[model samples]
Target: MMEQVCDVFDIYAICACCKVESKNEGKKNEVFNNYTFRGLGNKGVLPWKCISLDMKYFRAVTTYVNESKYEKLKYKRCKYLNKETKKLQNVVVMGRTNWESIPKKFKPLSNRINVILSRTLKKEDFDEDVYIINKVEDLIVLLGKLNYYKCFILGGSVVYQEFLEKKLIKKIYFTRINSTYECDVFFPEINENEYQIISVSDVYTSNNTTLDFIIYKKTNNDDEEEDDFVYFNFNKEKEEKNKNSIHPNDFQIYNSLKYKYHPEYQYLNIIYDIMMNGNKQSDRTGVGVLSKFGYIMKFDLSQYFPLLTTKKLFLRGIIEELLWFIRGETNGNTLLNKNVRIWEANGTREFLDNRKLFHREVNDLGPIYGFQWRHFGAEYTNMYDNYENKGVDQLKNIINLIKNDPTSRRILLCAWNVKDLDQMALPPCHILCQFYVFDGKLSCIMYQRSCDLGLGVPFNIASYSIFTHMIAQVCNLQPAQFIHVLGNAHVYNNHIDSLKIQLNRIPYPFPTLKLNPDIKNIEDFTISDFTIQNYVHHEKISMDM
Candidate 1:
């Protein structure tokens, strides 16, 4: 008897109904109000060629399409059936509980065949037109014989999960209600990787409940042949092209040296080119590095920020550290207060003592970036020392040069002070940055003597970019571009594995940095005055410095 139904239905469509659960609730007595059926099966193969059919489910019956405003919601499902299929029609397959939950007036749903799955119900228990099946395979067989093109599993969780697990479902329709209500059961998680979103409806609102509709088709081999009409094939050609367009040794042209301006790939290619071609050399840290003599990477700030998206970057720390530098702070105490510890390894007392370095206090960084930028060559005692009239303010003078003499090539800011390099905890890796202004836009090119490809290069890129942005904002100019020239760009041997991980990943779009427009003075800008938006990247990579 169960096998009889399998001979009828050819296709199974899942119309999953999700009633938002409330914070707290008690079970109601109605069949629909309770967990009605085991949800659709997950493992069975789709039985039909279904190209013309579609399914839909209501999220909130009362708020969205209650009987009072039912016609106004303008609900639609595929009413048309294939002319060639003898019994082509749309049918709703549900558990007995869901069938009973419907009001008596709407019991046999209008125009569509109704299928109820139950072990206890006899043919007499339902309307004469309604078919009752004890097993799902029987229903599929019956629907196939009847030439039904689609079968919608309007679930109780039991019925939905059953069809889902059996893989009988070819497509799923989801309706989401903004308002939450108490529910006893829920739909299972649809693995998005296994299925792709085919369509999403514009949000609609009726009363207080907001509504959204989404359609998903299971991503499978069958998708490319007959079901192609049902879904847009997003990557079919790309996959085939990638496979057909390649041979092993012909890959020589795919190197970083081959490409010039791909933001993500350029950085990756640079690292790869240096590693494969550059000679191995030992560094001051005793960690050997893959050394490249010279290289330059260009970033158009007018187009986007230069934050590398291949690996996850902590921009908050980058911004905070930049702000500390802008504020002329040589002490690590302020950065420590803000929970940024990029300088911790170098600024610590043990490291300084080991190097026989000079620091007024344990947390003092000995006039590093912030001090060098604000007070270039002054007798620095502590972070609180007055250096206003004591030293040349390179950042201040350069900002004036950009505003006053935009065409002058004399605008330069240097941190490689030969006199202060010995007194500092860590000599600057990024030595000097020169600003170029033209066409009401500001551009900067920085030179780094020793570039740490894995750990320090990202910070250096972001640091200079932020500086250019800050200076540009104060000078009433837009940041045009940032060019980085490295003398000895090397990846430490220990960092090679981590760099490989980054090189494998693709970069996301650079995030926009918004600055407070009201502040005109560079010194007036604070950490709260900046915001980085739309930053997307991969997971953080931990590398030993």
Candidate 2:
């Protein structure tokens, strides 16, 4: 099917899908719009069976070509002819897939010019009156020469993504279905800073699916005209990220107190940074990685706990790991018994043999993190031996410093025991960390030599932040900042797609963690003593360890 037939000059672009209870703002009936965009499509279809209101909203937004946008005769007058009444009309631009998906009865999408961009289709392919083009540049030229009102990129994720990459979309008519649906195709990320929500309609429901109609207009909407000579500057790194390069003062997290600019964006920002600019290389694990040499991230514990609001996560294993470390427990079996088998993989004889690691006792992790923290410099021995009083006891010393000297610069913890690197099941990714106390507040600066940005960083961030809070409570100080300094911050190749999904999510305010205050000593705290408050987050996204 084609435009058996097919106005204006200035451009207006639109596309959308979304659903959450809207503010239900003052409505002029139908003018204009989290995104929860992950559920927008399954394969190539809308996940929801149908929401009549959303369909009407999509049609209203696409069909209403604002006449005020064009001056009387300036918009390439009537290369656009009308049907029946013979008047000019607006157009819908989409990819070949979207054109094919339309019901044959609506093939040319009545009353509007149907422009299908594809490399495979040609003029002789169909007798229908649609415009088939080999390139996006041709679309631009066609619009400049043709008479149309405004353009709406109809459907198909690939087309949505392409138009977005061109930075051509000026507005969006998002129809959010407030329910989960299996989706393989997805709308590209919207740089929220660039657009402002113009309006939100009252929520509607049908067939058990909730819907919200939203319209977002460009923050700096203008009547700028395009020409063949205009530079279509497309920086791959800046595709869906910040406009300027990644740096301080470039993001709201660094410049404003807005809740939308949560600290999680700080982590997401880095993942995108590595994706676009990182050096790609295969790692020692026989898997490849997008690697960046050095990076640092900081969270203010005074506000909310930064346990990644972009995805759901539980803190049980992290808390247990910390407890195990503090108790100087090196046996992996303890965690396995509790259903926390994070260490089981590395402790198995098969894995240990590959790393040339051995222990006189099974499940013995060979004096890893907890041992080095509780008893630094402890003599080499199997997990069965007790070395409670042997090492310098750095944990005790640090606690003492925080309590007695609060200002001491010597309060530090180092887990990179150069002498035992070969003896342990695995060396610590978080190798060294130091404490700073001032004005009755405690902060920590941890130095990690290696990091798995996808899974490890979020878990590690929460792990240490809570530790800082625990340490603060025991020493009668307020928890301040947790600064993470990284050496080899990298993303495993297999986890790239998942990371991309994470980047597209709208971040919620961080959750809060409450530690039982009655327990004053760190050693006295148990799993039951910890509680998470308002742990609001997006759906869980999986990753391979």
Candidate 3:
């Protein structure tokens, strides 16, 4: 039976071969007699096949033991101590024999919430901290009541089979060991059709034993009713795949949040802090906002690119828009050509006509961020206006200062040229950005006069961060930090619900930003020169802009 089940190609194939003999059906069905649905569990529906069918439960003829079991499962049941909640939570569930089989020295599995299942044992026989449950349903109820974050099930075959049959396992972390072990006990086979691989780790070898770790998530869609199911496709990490990856030249910024730690809600935390404390005020969009003036947020560029994880960010749009700005483009057609519509709201023909700016062409955002950076105080006639030697090249000077004299305090790139404000389609929200070099690393501090907290803030953060990275690469220095100083940060009243949704969710780990090392000049950077890895984020929120 074990060989037949394990030999199958997919997980669903095991279900067909795991049928019970007619003689043993009546006896085995007795164990699962009360395991019916009341629609109170995490997964509401009961399995269709098991509704009226009698199923047999397998028992091992001999206690199954693996020789490398201890080494194989060192950190399988790791504990996490949350200082914020003041909780030490290590949850592991197993059957009675599985608990008893553990050596006496590790019986209770110190600091963990140990749940042991036994139908025959009395309450008095159990350890002081260990929980006792007779069935899986009771175990589920207990876990729900306790508000546990995650519950890991360790097995003695019965517990594994019970949970697998119940359709309760959301994910599986499998370890494939090269050396085969002859045992009476076996893991329940699963169909690959029912689950998708989240990540697969590289193979590891130790003392002639090779192993691979794979994580699989169940195919159930909670929002199937909404009819929108989007799968996120991310590639697995490889050591040798990116040998030319750029490394920091001077300082390595440590992640304030550690490995496997819940995401730091840095962006959302700021929103909440501002919303609760900000004063109510009106804005240019005629939509009211909860406004806060003069606040600062710092991001360590080396740790992670400062992109918001609470909402799905349009990374392609963000990158293309930045590229457009760096190319000294002021025409909306350039952005539209790259499928970037962020500028279309302000650059539209109707918008410019309403403003009575007759001198500008359609989709021409006159003297915006790009124009001012490349040609500061240039003669502005149209988007194609020639400024050969008529303007101050602020971007060129800043780049030159960083390369020649890294300690110069005059390294400033100002987009808010007072003389050109009248010709612009819209005034620069992020006006001035100053670059600083200390200890061979680059940092940028940007000042924004007005911020659309929900919509504009994310774009501003990513744009400047990428800009800092580009400047760093060009200057032969590593990106160290990005500082945002907002004068009037406000969330539009219409966007309040979206901000609330963002606040409730936990963040995933920050993704790594990879830049192509072959490109020496900042102006030569294209969309293909960059890649963002492991960017796991929540669904995007739509806001009324």
lDDT of each: 0.65, 0.72, 0.63
User: Relative to the unseen true structure, what is the C-alpha lDDT of residue 261 in candidate 3, on a scale of 0 to 100?
Assistant: 28
Clashing residue pairs, backbone N/CA/C < 3 A, model 3: 11-190, 11-191, 11-192, 12-191
Badly placed stretches (over 4 Å) of model 2 are: 1-260
lDDT of 2 by residue, 1-545 (tens): 22111113334455445432234463223222154443456556665666676677667766776556555544234433332224567778878877776678877877788888888889889778999988877887787666677777785788777766666666676665544555566777677776655554433344444444555565543335554235454433445453323444333232232222346767887887887678778998878988889999988887668788677788999899999888988888889999997798888878888777644456788879988988878786778778869887888889999999888899999999998888888888898779999999999999989989999999999999999999999999999999999899898988976776776655544556789999798898899988875444677888762
Q: Each prediction's TM-score against the native?
A: 0.55, 0.57, 0.56
**Candidate 1 — worst ten consecutive residues by lDDT sum?**
45-54
The most accurate candidate by TM-score is 2
Choose 1 or 2, whichever is better by TM-score.
Answer: 2
Over 4 Å off, model 1: 1-261
lDDT of 1 by residue, 1-545 (tens): 22212222323444433344333354322122112211222223111112111223342221121233322211211122222312234567878766776668866776567788999988986556888899987875565445333457777667877777776666666554323444455676666555554544433333333334455566553456667664576545544333122233332323322222346555677787766666768878797878788989887776567677667676778788887887888878888888988888877879778657644468778878788888888888876777776788888899899999999999998988889887788898888999999999999999999888888888888888888888899999999879999998887889876676666553444556678999898888777888765454566778763
Q: Please write out the lDDT profile of model 3 over residues 191-234, one tens digit for every residue.
A: 55665545433333332333333455666445674543332323
Give me the displacement of residue 2 in model 2, in angstroms.
29
